[PDB]
Design a binder for this molecule. Structure first.
Ligand SMILES: C[C@H](O)c1nccn1Cc1cc(C#Cc2ccc(OCC(N)(CO)CO)cc2)on1
Ligand SMILES: [Zn+2]
Length: 299
């Protein structure tokens, strides 16, 4: 059967919250079968735990925030993208503060730390959500869609209206059967356009933001002296964001996501609409990994 996965060993990391600018200590711990991904604020007494599920999303402004009463875990999307790309079902994510550390702005450091610790298969069938019907949400010129597909693929189209894109929309499609999340998506960084800076300022956001954790773009060019990691790094990062948000479903997807100028807000509306429409999805397991429409790396 395709089995559930956890971490083989504990992972420790330190860094800064993109939004908060706070120093944060992160611990990823193995978790039992059917735990899912659970964030824990260990700075609070008692400890406050928030399952990484669509129902716990409280804010979708420039990040995905989990909320339980007055308690937040901000910017979950890049870490959750890492745990989706590595097929992790069960893990405790402990944080000493309100935000996941930004690291280099990408999922790269997370996939490296996790794959350094290793994964552990568990004696329970991995549960998948299979898309059975098309599910579409729009608002204005933004759209986000689930389409039936015997695999997992993400398509994204952005029109950022900026010289750096040379009058073209940026588009990419990745099928994770045939294409490496690790090599082709995980290294795509957070980006900040200087034209958004008075907005971020106005909102007291991106307090931890610098060239160390984001592609910084002025009116014309990437200012990062070492340039881009991918020719299309902006749209590859949008794909990374969407994989992170999609993992709030609580199970790996069998289907296709299409985004059209979509972001955290519309991604989370799509999830809510999918969950609500039980005609459009079912939970499936695979007794034979050889005949399933997806596969995983050795643990
Ligand atoms: C998190 C979400 O999933 C996400 N992923 C991709 C983009 N975003 C949204 C976002 C982007 C920023 C930023 C930023 C930022 C980066 C650098 C920066 O530095 C500007 C400067 N002061 C250098 O320190 C001048 O160069 C300022 C803001 O904050 N939220
Ligand atoms: Zn992001």
């Amino acid at each position: 059967m395709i089995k559930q996965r956890t971490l083989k060993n504990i992972i420790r990391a330190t860094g800064v919250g993109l939004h908060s600018g706070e120093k944060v200590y992160l611990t990823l711990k193995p978790a039992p079968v059917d735990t899912g991904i659970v964030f824990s604020r260990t700075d609070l007494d008692p400890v406050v735990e928030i399952p990484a599920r669509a129902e716990n999303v409280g804010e979708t402004t420039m990040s995905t925030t989990l909320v339980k009463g007055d308690v937040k875990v901000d910017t979950v999307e890049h870490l959750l993208s890492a745990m989706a790309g590595l097929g992790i079902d069960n893990a405790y994510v402990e944080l000493s503060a309100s935000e996941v550390p930004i690291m280099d702005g990408s999922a790269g450091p997370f996939v490296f730390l996790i794959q350094s610790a290793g994964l552990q298969e568990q004696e329970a069938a991995k549960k998948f959500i299979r898309i059975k019907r098309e599910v579409s949400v729009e608002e204005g010129d933004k759209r986000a869609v689930f389409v039936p597909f015997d695999g997992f693929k993400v398509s994204f189209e952005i029109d950022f209206d900026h010289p750096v894109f040379r009058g073209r929309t940026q588009q990419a499609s990745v099928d994770f059967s045939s294409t490496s999340f690790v090599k082709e998506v995980s290294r795509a960084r957070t980006f900040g356009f200087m034209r958004d800076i008075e907005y971020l300022r106005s909102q007291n956001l991106a307090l931890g933001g610098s060239v160390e954790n984001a592609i910084v773009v002025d009116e014309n060019r990437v200012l990062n002296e070492d340039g881009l990691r991918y020719e299309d790094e902006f749209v590859k990062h949008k794909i990374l964001d969407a994989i992170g948000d999609l993992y709030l479903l609580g199970n790996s997807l069998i289907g296709e996501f299409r985004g059209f100028k979509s972001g955290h807000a519309l991604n989370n509306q799509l999830l809510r609409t999918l969950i609500a429409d039980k005609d459009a999805w079912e939970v499936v397991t695979f007794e034979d990994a050889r005949t399933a429409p997806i596969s995983y790396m050795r643990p």
